[PDB]
Amino acid sequence: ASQITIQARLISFESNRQQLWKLMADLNTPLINELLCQLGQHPDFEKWQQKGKLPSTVVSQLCQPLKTDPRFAGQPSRLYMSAIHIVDYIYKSWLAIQKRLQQQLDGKTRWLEMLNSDAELVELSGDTLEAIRVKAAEILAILSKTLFDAYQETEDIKSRSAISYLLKNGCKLTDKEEDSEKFAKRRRQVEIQIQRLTEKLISRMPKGRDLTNAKWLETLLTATTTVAEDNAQAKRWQDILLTRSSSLPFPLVFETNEDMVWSKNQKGRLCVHFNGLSDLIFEVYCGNRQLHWFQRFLEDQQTKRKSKNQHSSGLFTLRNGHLVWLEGEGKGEPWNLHHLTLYCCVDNRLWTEEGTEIVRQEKADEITKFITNMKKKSDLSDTQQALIQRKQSTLTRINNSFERPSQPLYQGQSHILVGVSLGLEKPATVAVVDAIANKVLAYRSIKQLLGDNYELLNRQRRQQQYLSHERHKAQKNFSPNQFGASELGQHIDRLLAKAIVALARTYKAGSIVLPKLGDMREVVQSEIQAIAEQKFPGYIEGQQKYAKQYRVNVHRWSYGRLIQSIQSKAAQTGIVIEEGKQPIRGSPHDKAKELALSAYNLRLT
């Protein structure tokens, strides 16, 4: 999995774009809105929320009677498919971030029940804490998942108290019979995490997009002309009147690569037309850096044509493509203001012939497993047999190789690992360490990786404060000049990713190790709240202003973006990314060294 998106503007006539804008902003986005609303009020909805899997076909079932509707009719089939796919993905996400949140809440409740002090454990067990300690050592002799299973499995007060004592230290036997206030703060922190997860689980339903803003305009008339009767209704009117009038239709996900048919203009320019809309021809305006992808698209489609469809589109360097509208600055009709943009998702691994072989092996394994899975059932539907036929068709067609560039992949020395330490102040720090002999081959810092570019790092912090102030000075004036250094941060993290992967290449690394951070901006919020609740007992504003800057620094600390960028570059290059635990205490260099060493140690089994 090394999917990356390239983009290109699409240029055509004013009418060719009026057709698309009318056909999406007026018929496709309303279809997505109605599909979302219907998905919400479906009777099985609360069942889906219990799982993370919305059923495979439900969204299409609510769409089949919707295609013939008076206000949703007059669309290509592969665009009803776009709407179905968008809504299905929205609710495939929304049922996976609420199921895992519920799992976290359940686990945190179990841990809150787990947590007892030394005195509390003594009074519950009815024995001296020394017996608790001895039995806890005994049970540690007989990871944490096993202990939680043991606790949830037994009903004895003594054994369960032993589990509690063990997991209080984290499968450790610490004999420092002190710091009861520390336990009080820890229990307070766990309770705050419980409260925050509960506050999260009451989430808004997927909104959808209202381009017409009919509700806004109607509510303005209701609020001005009439008078509300209670506060709870005037508040709803106010909330509606302040909502954001979105003005961009949903994209068009074309999950089939061939739905975009490519051609060469009489001027040599590349051109696209999509399945269902062939009278609409769009001319590709890319940049030369992205030219080879589009030329590969045209060459691959022509190569499939010239073999009488003996070649499997499915090894195409194109996987799918969104067809979005950007936002333009100025005035005029929307088709003349917003720039149509094609976002093609390409499997970079397929560019080389050698990587194409890897992709071929992956697909030929997964799809023959699919064939075996369908061959056990005896239902033998007709379209099910059509699917079975297509699977063997892809099997047969996959062994016909297109002519692609050749690069002998990347032979990686398994010993030499790369450990990356992230931090609030040192965004990254890399240690190239050989595992056979623990001596680090090399160290680099945030000034070494950003060489000649290190000035950016300071300029990121110098102005992200400045912009943070400028926004504040413009909000009170209600000017739209709210700017932020998100692009600068993204550029800096991309530079770091390139530097780290280049360093791994130079020393012939066999892996890259990144820490598993977990919920990092939440644990610090909980800890700061717990500390401020004693530092400020009854003053909530004081509990908030306490460690404000530290918390906002954590929240804007983009560990996830940096990890994703490094993962993208390593996958593009072939470095096998692993994971480890960042040591809690230590210098960044030692942190990275021990991180990579631990990753190597755990990998061995």
């Binding site: 009439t226 005037a234 009147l241 004036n477």
Partner: protein, 85 residues
Amino acid sequence: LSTEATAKIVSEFGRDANDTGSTEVQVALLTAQINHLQGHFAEHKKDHHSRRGLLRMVSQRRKLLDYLKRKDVARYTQLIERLGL
């Protein structure tokens, strides 16, 4: 709101010679401003700095109407009929 308009609306919602600030007059002023602003909001859909003002005027008029309703329902009804709210 223009001074001439305020004087005219005070006189035309007047209860006597000197009643500026009577709940009827305050509701009349707020209603006049909101009625002028609704067209501006039909046209300029980006002027949020006026959106906050509109919300404030709506809430002020709502409070005034509730107060006058609790005090004197008769005056409340005749007022809400005069303004057609």
